[PDB]
Design an enzyme around this catalytic site. Structure first.
Site, short mmCIF file in Angstrom:
data_model
loop_
_atom_site.label_atom_id
_atom_site.label_comp_id
_atom_site.label_asym_id
_atom_site.label_seq_id
_atom_site.Cartn_x
_atom_site.Cartn_y
_atom_site.Cartn_z
N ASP A 159 -17.28 -50.41 24.64
CA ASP A 159 -17.32 -50.29 26.10
C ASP A 159 -18.59 -49.54 26.52
O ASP A 159 -19.51 -49.36 25.71
CB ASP A 159 -16.03 -49.66 26.66
CG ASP A 159 -15.87 -48.18 26.29
OD1 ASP A 159 -16.80 -47.60 25.70
OD2 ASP A 159 -14.81 -47.59 26.59
N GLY A 171 -18.20 -56.26 30.96
CA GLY A 171 -18.05 -54.86 30.60
C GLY A 171 -17.69 -54.59 29.14
O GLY A 171 -17.89 -53.47 28.66
N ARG A 174 1.20 -71.27 30.50
CA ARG A 174 0.53 -70.03 30.09
C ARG A 174 1.09 -68.79 30.81
O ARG A 174 0.48 -68.32 31.76
CB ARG A 174 -0.97 -70.14 30.35
CG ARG A 174 -1.78 -70.62 29.16
CD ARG A 174 -1.84 -69.56 28.07
NE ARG A 174 -2.84 -69.89 27.05
CZ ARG A 174 -3.18 -69.10 26.03
NH1 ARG A 174 -2.59 -67.92 25.87
NH2 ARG A 174 -4.10 -69.49 25.16
N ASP A 218 -17.77 -41.47 24.33
CA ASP A 218 -17.94 -40.57 25.49
C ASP A 218 -18.08 -39.09 25.08
O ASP A 218 -19.04 -38.41 25.47
CB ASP A 218 -16.82 -40.75 26.51
CG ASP A 218 -17.21 -41.72 27.64
OD1 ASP A 218 -18.32 -41.58 28.18
OD2 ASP A 218 -16.41 -42.63 27.97
N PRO A 255 -8.83 -53.49 19.44
CA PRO A 255 -9.57 -54.32 20.39
C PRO A 255 -9.02 -55.73 20.63
O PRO A 255 -9.65 -56.50 21.36
CB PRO A 255 -10.91 -54.49 19.69
CG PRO A 255 -10.50 -54.65 18.26
CD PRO A 255 -9.34 -53.69 18.07
N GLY A 274 -11.90 -39.83 21.22
CA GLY A 274 -12.72 -40.95 20.81
C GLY A 274 -14.14 -40.53 20.47
O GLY A 274 -14.59 -39.44 20.86
N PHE A 275 -14.87 -41.37 19.75
CA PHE A 275 -16.26 -41.08 19.43
C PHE A 275 -17.16 -41.06 20.69
O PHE A 275 -17.66 -40.01 21.07
CB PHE A 275 -16.80 -42.08 18.39
CG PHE A 275 -18.26 -41.86 18.00
CD1 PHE A 275 -18.71 -40.62 17.54
CD2 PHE A 275 -19.16 -42.92 18.03
CE1 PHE A 275 -20.05 -40.43 17.16
CE2 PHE A 275 -20.51 -42.74 17.64
CZ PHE A 275 -20.95 -41.49 17.21
N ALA A 324 -5.95 -60.37 29.38
CA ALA A 324 -4.91 -59.46 29.87
C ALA A 324 -3.53 -60.07 29.71
O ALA A 324 -2.55 -59.37 29.42
CB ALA A 324 -5.17 -59.07 31.32
N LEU A 325 -3.46 -61.38 29.89
CA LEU A 325 -2.26 -62.14 29.57
C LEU A 325 -1.92 -62.01 28.07
O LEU A 325 -0.78 -61.66 27.73
CB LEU A 325 -2.46 -63.61 29.95
CG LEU A 325 -1.23 -64.43 30.34
CD1 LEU A 325 -0.40 -64.75 29.11
CD2 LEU A 325 -0.39 -63.71 31.40
N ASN A 326 -2.88 -62.29 27.19
CA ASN A 326 -2.62 -62.16 25.74
C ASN A 326 -2.13 -60.77 25.37
O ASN A 326 -1.15 -60.62 24.65
CB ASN A 326 -3.84 -62.54 24.91
CG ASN A 326 -4.29 -63.98 25.14
OD1 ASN A 326 -3.48 -64.85 25.48
ND2 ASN A 326 -5.58 -64.23 24.96
O1 LIG Z 1 -15.46 -48.25 21.64
C1 LIG Z 1 -14.53 -47.95 22.43
O2 LIG Z 1 -14.10 -46.77 22.61
C2 LIG Z 1 -13.84 -49.14 23.27
C3 LIG Z 1 -14.02 -50.55 23.18
C4 LIG Z 1 -13.16 -51.16 24.15
S1 LIG Z 1 -12.65 -52.66 24.82
C5 LIG Z 1 -11.55 -51.89 25.91
C6 LIG Z 1 -11.57 -50.53 25.80
C7 LIG Z 1 -12.48 -50.10 24.80
N1 LIG Z 1 -12.90 -48.89 24.25
MG LIG Z 2 -14.66 -43.15 27.20
#
Ligand SMILES: O=C(O)c1cc2sccc2[nH]1
Ligand SMILES: [Mg+2]
Ligand SMILES: [Mg+2]
Length: 711
Positions: free
Chosen positions: A617, A602, A301, A446, A527, A443-444, A126-128
């Site tokens: 994710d 996660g 850092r 969900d 990513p 997005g793909f 999150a820092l990066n």
């Molecule tokens: O494949 C995705 O939609 C996805 C991978 C990652 S890592 C953080 C959010 C996120 N979304």
């Molecule tokens: Mg989603």
């Protein structure tokens, strides 16, 4: 019990302490009245929340039966469509409108370029991310496979100059494409100067300026011998660091040490699908990181400060040096025991996220003794179904603003377009947030999970790989851009597109992902900070502002295409193709679940069945499980199949985590692994989960692991 009684709420102590001791100080919000706000907002909004979730279940129930009462195949799409209108699933489109959202930063209304998403529970990542607003093209080119390692240019323990030269050449050429010199190439440049406010570039037998002097935007050092030169193209900044004394600058024809690209213009700190957070302790780890980001003192850092330049006309100016932050709260589904009821009922996590992350963001609006200079807080709300659930989000943010004493409409919303009921009513969804909306996004994973669940009873679906190219999703991708543009997104809000998941495949990203800005996407997901740098190349090549003008007014998708179900053709697959797909899906679930349940991870570099490293994710658990569950329902495979596949893939996953000390194998004691049983439950109980959501089973199983670890 270990809870603090406030009105009707029993707040987990860890939470109560964190808000009071760490979060509230500086916000000038009265701790007493804040907790009153919470108990009041929760009690007042919880029934509406619950009514929405109920309505999701009603609609699905009717669609389930409907499909089971079809005799005539193929599906009568005219009847199907009219049924959706009847049951209030498909609502009529509102008249044209234009969003009215004020107080939005330039990174969002105007600048097109990459947007980074990172698990908020990971301070270093999150820092990066926050510092990824600027990044080195050379490091990115040299570190990845963009420049091939084909004999001469391989990565070694020591720096390879054959490779370094190709990196240089690549960047030299990028300069030519992005900011062209009137005469000649950057590749032959020998020096850079600034006389009379114009940038001159030294060439072997001459010297030229930029074709458009306008692209010169600043520099550092003395105009006669600059330490850097700042170029702008397509609203995006390019910096040429000039240092002849450096290792690279020594052997460089103009003394160039590096090219720096304004990369991750914005970043999304994620509380949802990229993190595992199943209880109060997990939530405060998350919230604490968000606090450090907003106060500006997160460290492992530190966070970068802004950048100083001299204006072309010898003046002075500054550019931000941090990536403008959003936060992604969780959606409407889950409750979390960080706050429970007097009867033990968990409080809705979405409602909690609006309160706490919104409270915390106040720090980001004031001097770090800094974020939205125009005075906004940016929340990305996932997994909404339909305009009603969008209006609910507004009202939530409204109430939270009162509790926090913020001006109304301070808490902006990015509407994820990732559920079928939102897609086909997208114009209404945006209208419902017309004064708060700053962002749409497709997005793909969900969206495809929901596609499959919604049409579960219709019949067998096509393999996961085929979904990317199916009619419904192409229409969906285009329809999102159109609804955004038609609602006036160009110049006002981001129209975004999905994540590149193959973290090691950067050459492939650099050739492929360009289609997203070409599709009119003001931004798209990457990513890592490295990938954000490489993806920045695409906005230098594509003029997104122009692409969006050209698309304006076109209706490139019809409700009929949106509603085209990805049913599979009768007897489409050979038995080995079926096995390959089952083994593939069980490996995707097992690979992600084991890390999730055993280690609270996660998102990570998970090798797939062919050992390609995907950074997905939790959405990858929804699609994969829904698909095997679909295939199960319709007799494409058996239960003996699913079990046998899981038992083959678990040893495979085991070896793929051979380098992990903390790893617990799933083989051979399958029924004794909580991870294995979770993977199995997601598949066998999949058809029964609300809209295919994986959180209920996953959260419960992670909490089960936490308890066996508590012994
Ligand atoms: O494949 C995705 O939609 C996805 C991978 C990652 S890592 C953080 C959010 C996120 N979304
Ligand atoms: Mg989603
Ligand atoms: Mg151009």
């Amino acid at each position: 019990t270990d809870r603090v009684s406030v009105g009707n709420l029993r707040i987990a102590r860890v939470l109560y302490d964190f808000v009071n001791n760490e979060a509230l100080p500086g916000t000038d919000i009265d701790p007493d009245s804040f907790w009153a706000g919470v108990d009041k907002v929760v009690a007042d909004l919880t029934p509406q929340n619950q009514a929405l979730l109920n309505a999701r279940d009603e609609l699905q129930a009717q669609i389930d039966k409907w499909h089971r009462r079809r005799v005539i195949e193929p599906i009568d799409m005219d009847a199907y469509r009219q049924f959706l209108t009847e049951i209030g699933y498909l609502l009529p489109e509102p008249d044209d409108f234009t969003i009215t959202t004020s107080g939005v930063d330039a990174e969002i209304t105007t600048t097109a370029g990459p947007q980074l998403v990172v698990p908020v529970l990971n301070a270093r990542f999150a820092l990066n991310a926050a510092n990824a607003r600027w990044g080195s093209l050379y490091d990115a080119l040299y570190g990845t496979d963009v420049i091939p390692e084909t004999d001469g240019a391989e990565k070694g323990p020591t720096y390879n100059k054959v490779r370094g030269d190709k990196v240089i050449a690549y960047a030299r050429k990028f300069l030519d494409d992005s900011v062209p010199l009137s005469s000649g190439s950057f590749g032959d440049a020998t020096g850079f100067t600034v006389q009379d406010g114009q940038l001159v570039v030294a060439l072997p037998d001459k010297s030229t300026g930029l074709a458009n002097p306008g692209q010169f935007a600043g520099y550092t050092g003395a105009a006669e011998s600059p330490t850097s030169v700042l170029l702008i193209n397509h609203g995006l900044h390019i910096e040429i660091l000039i240092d002849p004394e450096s290792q690279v600058g020594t052997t460089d024809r103009a003394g160039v040490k590096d090219v720096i690209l304004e990369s991750a213009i914005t970043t999304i700190m994620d509380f949802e699908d990229s993190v595992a957070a199943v209880d109060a302790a997990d939530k405060v780890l998350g919230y604490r990181n968000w606090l450090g980001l907003n106060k500006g003192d997160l460290a492992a850092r530190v966070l970068n400060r802004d950048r100083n330049y001299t204006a072309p006309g010898g003046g002075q100016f500054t550019l931000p040096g941090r990536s403008l932050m959003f936060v992604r709260n969780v959606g409407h589904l889950m409750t979390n025991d960080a706050i429970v009821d007097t009867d033990g009922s968990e409080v809705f996590e979405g409602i909690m996220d609006a309160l706490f992350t919104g409270l915390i963001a106040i720090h980001g609006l004031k001097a770090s003794d800094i974020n939205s200079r125009t005075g906004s807080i940016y929340i990305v709300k996932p997994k909404m179904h339909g305009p009603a659930e969008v209006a609910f989000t507004c009202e939530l943010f409204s109430r939270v603003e009162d509790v926090l004493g913020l001006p109304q409409n301070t808490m902006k919303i990015g509407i994820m377009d990732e559920e079928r009921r939102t897609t086909v009513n997208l114009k209404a969804c945006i209208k419902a947030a017309a004064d708060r909306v700053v962002f749409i996004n497709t997005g793909f994973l969900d969206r495809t999970g929901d596609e499959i669940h919604t049409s579960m009873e219709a019949g067998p679906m096509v393999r996961k790989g085929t979904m990317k190219s199916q009619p419904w999703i192409l229409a969906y991708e285009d329809h999102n851009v159109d609804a955004g543009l038609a609602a006036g997104f160009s110049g006002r809000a981001q129209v975004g597109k999905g994540m590149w998941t193959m973290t090691e495949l950067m050459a492939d990203m650099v050739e492929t992902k360009i289609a997203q800005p070409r599709a009119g996407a003001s931004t798209a997901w990457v990513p890592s900070p490295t990938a954000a740098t490489l993806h920045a190349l695409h906005y230098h090549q594509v003029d997104v502002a122009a692409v969006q003008q050209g698309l304006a007014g076109k209706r490139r998708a019809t409700i009929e295409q949106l509603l085209t179900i990805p049913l599979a053709k009768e007897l489409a697959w050979a038995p080995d193709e079926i096995r390959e797909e089952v083994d593939n899906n069980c490996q995707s679930i097992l690979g992600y679940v084991v890390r999730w349940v055993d280690q609270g991870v996660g998102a990570s570099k998970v090798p797939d069945i062919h050992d390609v490293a995907l950074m997905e994710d939790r959405a990858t658990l929804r699609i994969s499980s829904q698909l095997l569950a679909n295939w199960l329902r319709h007799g494409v495979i058996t239960s003996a199949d699913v079990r046998a596949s899981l038992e083959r893939m678990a040893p495979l996953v085991d070896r793929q985590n051979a380098g992990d000390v903390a790893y617990r194998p799933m083989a051979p004691n399958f029924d004794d692994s909580i991870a294995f049983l979770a993977a199995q439950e997601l598949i066998l109980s999949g058809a029964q989960q609300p809209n295919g959501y994986t959180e209920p089973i996953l959260h419960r199983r992670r909490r089960e692991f936490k308890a066996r670890a508590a012994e």
